[PDB]
Design a protein around this ligand. Structure first.
Ligand SMILES: CCCCCCCCCCCCCCCCCC(=O)OC[C@H](COP(=O)([O-])OCC(O)COP(=O)([O-])OC[C@@H](COC(=O)CCCCCCCCCCCCCCCCC)OC(=O)CCCCCCCCCCCCCCCCC)OC(=O)CCCCCCCCCCCCCCCCC
Ligand SMILES: CCCCCCCCCCCCCCCCCC(=O)OC[C@H](COP(=O)([O-])OCC(O)COP(=O)([O-])OC[C@@H](COC(=O)CCCCCCCCCCCCCCCCC)OC(=O)CCCCCCCCCCCCCCCCC)OC(=O)CCCCCCCCCCCCCCCCC
Ligand code: BCL
Ligand code: BCL
Ligand SMILES: CC[C@H]1c2cc3[nH]c4c(c3C)C(=O)[C@H](C(=O)OC)c4c3nc(cc4[nH]c(cc(n2)[C@@H]1C)c(C(C)=O)c4C)[C@@H](C)[C@@H]3CCC(=O)OC/C=C(\C)CCC[C@H](C)CCC[C@H](C)CCCC(C)C
Ligand SMILES: COC1=C(OC)C(=O)C(C/C=C(\C)CC/C=C(\C)CC/C=C(\C)CC/C=C(\C)CC/C=C(\C)CC/C=C(\C)CC/C=C(\C)CC/C=C(\C)CC/C=C(\C)CCC=C(C)C)=C(C)C1=O
Ligand SMILES: CCCCCCCCCCCCCCCCCC(=O)OC[C@H](COP(=O)([O-])OCC[N+](C)(C)C)OC(=O)CCCCCCCCCCCCCCCCC
Ligand SMILES: COC(C)(C)C/C=C/C(C)=C/C=C/C(C)=C/C=C/C(C)=C/C=C/C=C(C)/C=C\C=C(\C)CC/C=C(\C)CCC=C(C)C
Ligand SMILES: COC(C)(C)C/C=C/C(C)=C/C=C/C(C)=C/C=C/C(C)=C/C=C\C=C(C)\C=C\C=C(/C)CC/C=C(\C)CCC=C(C)C
Ligand SMILES: COC(C)(C)C\C=C/C(C)=C/C=C/C(C)=C/C=C/C(C)=C/C=C/C=C(C)/C=C/C=C(\C)CC/C=C(\C)CCC=C(C)C
Lengths: 304, 52, 254, 43, 281, 52, 52, 43, 51, 43, 43, 52, 41, 52, 43
């Protein structure tokens, strides 16, 4: 009747600084912290981070990005702090005017957008390389980078590629909290009803499937945590009744099952296919299809 | 002067890469600033100069 | 590339969606084959090998090279399944037909069947990267102190029949993870026995174990070492305890 | 003496090299800014 | 039909209702009382979908659509050809889902594992019900629910969302979105991490939990732990669906206008309203 | 005044870093405030001043 | 005159850095309120004084 | 005693040189405010 | 005997709480004054002095 | 002690200094208030 | 006492070099604000 | 009469802070409700007492 | 429940009540003061 | 002249990755930019020159 | 002196080859830019 959601008893010790497997220890920090508010739901150690080159690139570029957008927010607000904290959500570093096409915008808002985007480019790619390297230094696999690359694919398709194919940086997303929502709506409305973008439907299928799957996996692993199912790496190699019971639950339930490694394989795909299908479905919007409801009618999933 | 003591408090690696990033990004930023201006845009300038 | 049909109504969009169907087919193949590394070949109730071995073929063996010189593990393999194979099973067929249960012949918590089943993991303990044991009692774990929560040590252990059996003595911890896995009991019978923390609910005045009743706390498997605990002993203990949610329910009160 | 652990000799020479590079850089920068002002004054 | 370890678990017991009656397996599947119920309900709903599209004369699986009664029908039962089919299919679907959950329960207690999974599923049933049962009742009519068509419940979504302008401005919707995105994110990260440990660079030994914790501490300065990530993704999904149910039950019952006008209470606070600056001045 | 003991209070490396970011961000804030105002824009003004 | 004691209660490092952030934010906020108001915008007032 | 662990003397010396600092800040502030009052009177 | 509070509460906590609270209060009062055309000192000053 | 374990007398000292600070604060505030009522009264 | 552990004399030389760079930066900024005042004033 | 042990019942520390928060919040809300009513707004009454 | 108030429960409560008194006298003076100036009932 | 000590700081197998990446990014940026300009778009200007 | 496990002999060889390649790349780039100036000048 203990469901293992919140940890009852906390323990700790000298911080677990790390594992030296080819990591540069000098680029690592040495200060840790304990914060029990988390210990209740997870580890409490806000442990040492790695301060590297790619990380510095990312931090610098992305902070310039952030503060650039904040600068334009101020200018757009009359420098009145109360306007800033009033219209904070309604403000925007809107995207260049279509007149400029793909040329360097000849306005302030536009070039600020362009520069902030350059910074984001640098930051994201630096962080991807940082994932690759941190997994190469500890001697692990690069699955995390190839998953992130999926996210990068969508993000690029939206900021860089799709517009280049359409010939306008106007197509790209504004940097605001409500304006990028408005952008999504206007994108759907301009191009038919995006629902009828089969790849949109697939990305949705995989988002819902990711939630489905993580609830399944998590509830299972907490159910078999009384047999140490939380320790998975050791149930792939030294199988125990945790894995057997989980597999047999799902077998007796739906007729098929997985293994303590293959469920992880299933997760890595439902995740990345959310942004692989999205990128394609966004590329094809306006370059291959100016309206999706009619494509549906013609293709048979929508009625005449 | 005793500026040469800074390398007793800073490590060459972090500082070098930070300075590289900072300078390159600054160059790009200022170049784009200029090209946004119908004036100082060397492309458009040399365009009008040679009458093309 | 708008309104450009290669043939019929087929444009880049159609080609892409169809290519995706194909890739997806290959992917379901891949995943449902990689979910075969454990459990196959399919058996009957007789222990034989059956004709229906699935429509997806078992894949080609890979290899896991373990840390701390524990060797090479090959999945799928005969060694893998035969090690984790249970024998001398106290079970009786309920019918000659297949698809019907198999009753426990004797005491199941002991005979290791049903929810109380265990699996022959290897009687070597679980290790960290450094090769030190993962589970240490909090007293050997240098530096380990309670950083929060109710320190259970010394609290009585109420059981499913509401009766009391002993007092907690020590906490067994996952040092690399910094969390409490097992708790130990100083039983009335003069014995020490472990019980998983996930099966024990720390109250303010006590520790409640609604899984099993009191008659069972004594027949719990023990540890050949009081400073370490292996994966095998862990499975035996955990199965025994968890089986009480079915096999000691006539005793559970409240 | 040092949070980095280095010596005065190593730091002295490191600084000499870094500053020679800095001077080369600043030199080219001034050259170019001057050629520009001549090309299109911004003041 | 059995796995090399499926036997010692095929023991009797763990049944909420029934007993020996129905404690058996059909192929891989366990069928108790509730297995029989879910099969019956599912099969009936399926056949009724097919008859509904047969009456219509539609046979394309994408254009097949069984729609709810008119809104004017109100909350009464309608003719099978004008809503009764949708209603019976809804009944059968709900029975099927609840029975699936209770089957999961029977199995969880035969295999001696916790009941987290049926709990998780309960939230999804709750949301489906919010859509087809509760929200209507509070809105006065079955016809406000969604249809059983692959590409038509999307039209219901669109029209229902444009009734209140850009539904994006519903805050509970915002939270649903955010938790869904974070769920996919954490799922990918977990899978990638584990596979990267188990399947490392060539010529290297398998890795352990310590390497995972260290890699993510290196990356972002915090690691949640092997148990904490499961806890987390579970809670993310649940709160998402919680917020998603909350977003819909308040859409046409407590709210009635465009959702944008909600955030204008922050603008219209007297000490920054008149200020002439920004977007709202 | 004996302010030097602030260096006995907290460390040089971190205060140096913060100082650098603070100064650069401030310099940029101010230069931008200027560019935003029509006059004080060193570029458009020079364009007025020199023709073009 | 007993005020020197506080530092026996606080760690002057934390006090000092929090003090610094406080002061800087206050400055930028006060200066900004002033820039925002049409009067007190030293830049617009100047440009009106020198008629630019 | 001292939550900080600071010496009693340490406390007096820290507050003193700290006060020199707070005072410098205040004096520059007064000079500036006064200057502005002449150029623009806010009251 | 109001000196007895120091035994119940910690001065470190009280200073870091009271300070933030008082700052907030001052900011709020000032803002309420500013929101009113009257009591907006910057505004009043500009008119009185003719600017 | 029961809670903080603050030494008495020192706690009384803490009360004294705290009170001095409070009095200082309130006085400055009232002076400011009186300054204002005369400049722009409210009552 | 010395949380950082920097010695008194190491601290003194640190502050010396720090303030050298500081005054350099400050007088350069002064040069700059002067030149600005000359081409375009702002007060 | 016998109210001495309200403290044996309640830990003094939490209770005092909660009391404080509650009182402050309640005052703020009543003042707000008064300022909300044009008739009851003290600042506006001053606008009547003095012509300003 | 605290177990530290066995003796000073009296002291704690009494001083708390004294504070309460100061606060309430100030409050009553304030209420009288406002009622004449603007009367609310 | 003693620049050769940079390689006593940076392990070159990462520096070379970074450098090649940077250079390709830059080449693409400038090529594209020029392609965005009808005056410097070599394809279109050649089309017009030869008269095709 | 060395944080990268290299010695002067190694590093001087390395800078030699690196600068060879760099001069070659700069050479082809200069040639190209000159040909383009002839083709279409940007100044
Ligand atoms: C008419 C047409 C009809 C239909 C045609 C259909 C034909 C079907 C053919 C069969 C295809 C099946 C593919 C699935 C098999 C993968 C199985 C698996 O999970 O693991 C396998 C297994 C994983 O190994 P492991 O168990 O992790 O351990 C290996 C190591 O020990 C330790 O690992 P490690 O750390 O060394 O490396 C880990 C990595 C092992 O793999 C690798 O190391 C290499 C992985 C590929 C990385 C990229 C290659 C390098 C160049 C990339 C160029 C990018 C340009 C952008 C800028 C540069 C960025 C770097 O593990 C993986 O999981 C690899 C799979 C990754 C797939 C790609 C995911 C990211 C893509 C995101 C989208 C971005 C592109 C846009 C797509 C849309 C375009 C329109 O790897 C293999 O079996 C070999 C690798 C396969 C190479 C890639 C080929 C498949 C890519 C398909 C992508 C989807 C395309 C879209 C579909 C079509 C839509 C229209
Ligand atoms: C291991 C499996 C892996 C699977 C994935 C692998 C993916 C890799 C690639 C594999 C290759 C796939 C093929 C790709 C290329 C072709 C795709 C395509 O459909 O192009 C359009 C092309 C037609 O172009 P169009 O301009 O629309 O038609 C002009 C016609 O002259 C006349 O058409 P129309 O202009 O008259 O209009 C259409 C008309 C007539 O439509 C038709 O011609 C055929 C419609 C019925 C097709 C039924 C297909 C049933 C297939 C599924 C059933 C077995 C289950 C197998 C799958 C199990 C798993 C779910 O619609 C009606 O229903 C008229 C009703 C009478 C009115 C009075 O395809 C067709 O010929 C029709 C569909 C053909 C059957 C698709 C089978 C799937
Ligand atoms: C969630 C709130 C909206 C909704 C909005 C959307 C949106 C938006 C989309 C769909 C899409 C889908 N939805 Mg939905 N959907 C709703 C309610 C439902 C219900 C239900 C019983 O209530 C079902 C069964 C479906 C069914 C479906 C599938 C046809 C498709 C992919 C889902 C998926 O991958 O799931 C995740 C889980 C899995 C991967 C498991 C697979 C389950 C299978 C595929 C479900 C098919 C059902 C079958 C055809 C009918 C039964 C007989 N939705 C409600 C009304 N749904 C997407 C699509 O492509 O539609 C064309 C899409 O774009
Ligand atoms: C009303 C408007 C249209 C609509 C318009 C769009 C548009 C337009 C898009 C989709 C897209 C998506 N929509 Mg929608 N969408 C609609 C209807 C729906 C419905 C529904 C139930 O009706 C659902 C459930 C969905 C579902 C989805 C997702 C499946 C998909 C995006 C997934 C994702 O991860 O995005 C978010 C993922 C990313 C952007 C990844 C970005 C990652 C990078 C690396 C971020 C950088 C980090 C940065 C530096 C910040 C730093 C933070 C700090 C360090 C903390 N939409 C309606 C009908 N939708 C997307 C898609 O794929 O299109 C097909 C898309 O672009
Ligand atoms: C596979 C698809 C999903 C995905 C995956 C994904 N994202 C990722 C990763 C992965 C696998 C990482 O490893 C990386 C990470 O570190 O995650 C914790 C990351 C990441 N994706 C992120 C966010 C993010 N992911 C999102 C979603 C998704 N990415 C998809 C659902 C979304 C949304 C809204 O869709 C967001 C906002 C970041 C947390 C991180 C990228 C880090 C980065 O590039 O930071 C650059 C900026 C700075 C360092 C400075 C910021 C300055 C300000 C102070 C802030
Ligand atoms: C820790 O490791 C883990 C595993 O491994 C031990 C696992 O496997 C899993 C399980 C996860 C997977 C297998 C991954 C794949 C899962 C998905 C993609 C989720 C979506 C699933 C599907 C699309 C399949 C859905 C199938 C269903 C609902 C079954 C349909 C069957 C029927 C209706 C027939 C039912 C028959 C009955 C009741 C009996 C009939 C009665 C008669 C009298 C006749 C997890 C989570 C895990 O964490
Ligand atoms: C439509 C989408 C699939 C619906 C489910 C169809 C299969 C089913 O219900 O049971 C299959 C049956 C049900 O159990 P079973 O016991 O009949 O299967 C036995 C499987 N073997 C022989 C391999 C042991 O399961 C299988 O066939 C096993 C693999 C199925 C994998 C299905 C995964 C689909 C994921 C979809 C993701 C993309 C969505 C977009
Ligand atoms: C908002 O307006 C509407 C319209 C809603 C009308 C109002 C509605 C309602 C419901 C109003 C409710 C008002 C209430 C509940 C008011 C209650 C007020 C009380 C009970 C105030 C009591 C104050 C008491 C004080 C301040 C007592 C002590 C003060 C101190 C500073 C504590 C000092 C104590 C020490 C030092 C403890 C000694 C410690 C030791 C160890 C000996
Ligand atoms: C408190 O105030 C201060 C000023 C102190 C700080 C405040 C800062 C604030 C308020 C910051 C706010 C930031 C916000 C609101 C950011 C929001 C961002 C959002 C919502 C972005 C959403 C989507 C963005 C996308 C998809 C952008 C993609 C961009 C790219 C892929 C860039 C690709 C490259 C481009 C466009 C061209 C440049 C390329 C090259 C090679 C130079
Ligand atoms: C206008 O309408 C609204 C509703 C907006 C607001 C109207 C009315 C309201 C809500 C009014 C609220 C008023 C309140 C709650 C005022 C409270 C004021 C207090 C309690 C002020 C206290 C100030 C205390 C100060 C400044 C204390 C300073 C103390 C020190 C500097 C001493 C530090 C050094 C020490 C203790 C030495 C260290 C000691 C040892 C032993 C090492």
């Amino acid at each position: 009747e203990y469901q293992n959601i919140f940890t009852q008893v906390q323990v700790g010790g000298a911080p677990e600084m790390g594992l030296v497997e080819g990591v540069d220890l000098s680029n690592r920090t040495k200060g840790t912290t304990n914060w029990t508010l988390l210990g209740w739901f997870g580890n409490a150690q806000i442990g040492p981070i790695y301060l590297g080159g790619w990380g510095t690139v990312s931090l610098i570029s992305g902070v310039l990005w952030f503060m650039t957008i904040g600068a334009w927010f101020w200018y757009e607000a009359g420098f009145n702090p109360a306007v800033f904290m009033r219209d904070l959500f309604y403000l925007s570093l809107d995207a260049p005017d279509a007149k400029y096409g793909l040329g360097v915008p000849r306005d302030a808002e536009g070039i600020m957008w362009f520069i902030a985007s350059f910074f984001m480019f640098v930051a994201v790619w630096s962080w991807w390389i940082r994932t690759y390297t941190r997994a190469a230094a500890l001697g692990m696999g690069k699955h995390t980078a190839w998953a992130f690359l999926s996210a990068i694919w969508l993000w690029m398709v939206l900021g860089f590629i799709r517009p280049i194919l359409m010939g306008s940086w106007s197509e790209a997303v504004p940097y605001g909290i409500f304006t990028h929502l408005d952008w999504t709506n206007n994108f759907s409305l301009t191009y038919g009803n995006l629902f009828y973008n089969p790849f949109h439907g697939l990305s949705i299928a995989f988002l819902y499937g990711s939630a489905l799957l993580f609830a399944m996996h998590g509830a299972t692993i907490l159910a078999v945590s009384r047999f140490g199912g939380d320790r998975e790496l050791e149930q792939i190699v030294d199988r125990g009744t945790a894995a057997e019971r989980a597999a047999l639950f799902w077998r007796w339930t739906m007729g098929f099952n997985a293994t303590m490694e293959g469920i992880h394989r299933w997760a890595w795909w439902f995740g990345v296919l959310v942004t692989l299908t999205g990128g394609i479905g966004i590329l094809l919007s306006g370059t291959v299809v100016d309206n999706w409801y009619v494509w549906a009618q013609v293709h048979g999933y929508a009625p005449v | 002067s005793k500026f040469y003591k800074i390398w007793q408090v800073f490590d060459p690696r972090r500082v070098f890469v930070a300075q590289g990033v900072f300078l390159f990004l600054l160059a790009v930023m200022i170049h784009l600033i200029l090209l946004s201006k119908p004036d100082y845009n060397w492309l458009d300038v040399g365009t009008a100069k040679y009458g093309r | 590339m708008v309104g450009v049909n290669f043939f019929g109504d087929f444009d880049l969009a159609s080609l892409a969606i169809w290519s995706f169907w194909g890739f997806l087919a290959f992917l379901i193949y891949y995943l449902q084959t990689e979910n075969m590394r454990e459990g196959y070949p399919l058996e009957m109730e007789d222990g034989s090998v059956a004709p229906n071995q699935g429509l997806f073929p078992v894949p080609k063996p890979k290899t896991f090279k373990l840390p701390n010189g524990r060797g090479e593990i090959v999945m799928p393999s005969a060694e893998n399944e035969a090690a984790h194979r249970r024998n001398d099973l106290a079970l009786a067929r309920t019918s000659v037909s297949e698809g019907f249960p198999h009753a426990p012949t004797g005491n199941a918590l002991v005979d290791g069947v049903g929810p109380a089943s265990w699996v022959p993991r290897r009687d070597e303990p679980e290790l960290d990267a450094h090769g030190h044991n993962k589970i240490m009692p909090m007293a050997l774990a240098k530096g380990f102190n309670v950083t929060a929560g109710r320190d259970p040590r010394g609290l009585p252990v109420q059981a499913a029949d509401l009766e009391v059996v002993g007092r907690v003595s020590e906490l067994w911890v996952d040092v690399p993870e910094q969390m409490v896995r097992y708790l130990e009991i100083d039983l009335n019978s003069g014995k020490k026995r472990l019980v998983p923390m996930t099966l024990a609910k720390i109250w303010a005045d006590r520790v409640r174990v609604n899984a099993i009743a009191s008659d069972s706390f004594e027949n719990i498997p023990a540890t050949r070492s009081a400073s370490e605990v292996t994966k095998l002993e862990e499975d035996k203990i955990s199965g025994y305890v968890a089986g009480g949610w079915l096999y000691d329910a006539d005793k559970r009160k409240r | 003496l040092s949070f980095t652990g280095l010596s005065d000799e190593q730091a002295q020479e490191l600084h000499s090299v870094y500053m020679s590079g800095l001077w080369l850089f600043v030199t080219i920068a001034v050259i170019a800014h001057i050629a520009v002002y001549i090309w299109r004054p911004w003041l | 039909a059995l796995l090399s370890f499926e036997r010692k678990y095929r023991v009797p017991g763990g049944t909420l209702v029934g007993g020996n009656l129905f404690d058996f397996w059909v192929g891989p599947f366990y069928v108790g009382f509730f297995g029989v119920t879910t099969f019956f309900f599912a099969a009936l709903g399926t056949l009724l979908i097919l008859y509904g599209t047969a009456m219509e004369g539609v046979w394309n699986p994408q254009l097949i659509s069984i729609e709810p009664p008119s809104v004017e029908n109100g909350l009464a039962f309608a003719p099978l050809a004008e809503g009764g089919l949708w209603q019976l299919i809804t009944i059968c679907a709900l029975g099927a889902f609840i029975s699936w959950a209770l089957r999961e329960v029977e199995i969880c207690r035969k295999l001696g594992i916790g009941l987290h999974i049926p709990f998780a599923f309960s939230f999804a049933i709750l949301a489906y019900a919010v859509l087809v049962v509760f929200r209507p009742l509070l809105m006065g009519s079955w016809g406000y629910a969604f249809p059983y068509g692959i590409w038509t419940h999307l039209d219901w979504v669109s029209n229902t969302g444009y009734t209140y302008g850009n539904f994006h401005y519903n805050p509970a919707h915002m939270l649903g979105i955010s938790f869904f995105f974070t769920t996919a994110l954490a799922l990918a990260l977990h899978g990638a991490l584990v596979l990267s440990a188990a399947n490392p660079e060539k010529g290297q030994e398998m890795k352990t939990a310590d390497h995972e914790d260290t890699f993510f501490r290196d990356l972002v300065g915090y690691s949640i732990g092997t148990l904490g990530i499961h806890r987390l993704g579970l809670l993310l999904a649940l709160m998402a669906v919680f917020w998603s149910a909350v977003c819909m039950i308040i859409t046409g019952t407590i709210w009635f206008d465009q959702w944008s006008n909600w955030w204008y209470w922050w603008v219209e606070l007297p000490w920054w309203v008149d200020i002439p600056g920004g977007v709202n001045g």
